[PDB]
Amino acid sequence: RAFSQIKDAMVFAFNLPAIVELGTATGFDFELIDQAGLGHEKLTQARNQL
Amino acid sequence: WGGSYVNDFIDRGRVKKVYVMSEAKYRMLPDDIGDWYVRAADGQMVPFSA
């Protein structure tokens, strides 16, 4: 909180997880792949849609 | 007469190869070697048969 006051500078504070070198909060890790010669500047859209 | 790869270009997002080489109909018979010249220090166009 005390940090959510520096102008442009996301300064979050957080606590280490259970076991450092393992996974994390029961969310997902999701990868968007490019399966034809589609460019960065094309994948980036696809990503932004989703 | 035996192609040479030079470096890679990017294709449709993929690193791929670049070969220089002759075209088919300039490397087929032992009498085509006649077509090839080569630059001299003097600047001349000297053919193999010299």
Tokens 């690193």 sit at which residue?
B15
Q: Give contacts of A36 with chain B, Cβ < 8 Å.
A: 12
Q: Which residue of B has its CA nearest to A42?
A: B13
Query: CA gyration radius for chain A?
Result: 17
Contact B31, B47 (CB under 8 A): no
Amino acid at A36: A
Q: And the tokens for A16?
A: 């280490």
Contact B21, B6 (CB under 8 A): no
Pairwise CA distance, residues A5 & B48, whole Å: 78
β-bridge partners, B15: B10
Q: Is B43 left (phi over 0), alpha (psi -120 to 50) or beta?
A: left
Q: Taking the mean position of all CA atoms in its chain, how far away is CA A17? A: 17
Q: And the tokens for A29?
A: 């890790």
Pairwise CA distance, residues A20 & A22, whole Å: 6
Contact B21, B36 (CB under 8 A): no
Contact B17, B3 (CB under 8 A): no
Q: Give contacts of B12 with chain A, Cβ < 8 Å.
A: 36-37
Contact B47, B37 (CB under 8 A): yes
Q: Taking the mean position of all CA atoms in its chain, how far away is CA A22? A: 17
Pairwise CA distance, residues A32 & A15, whole Å: 28
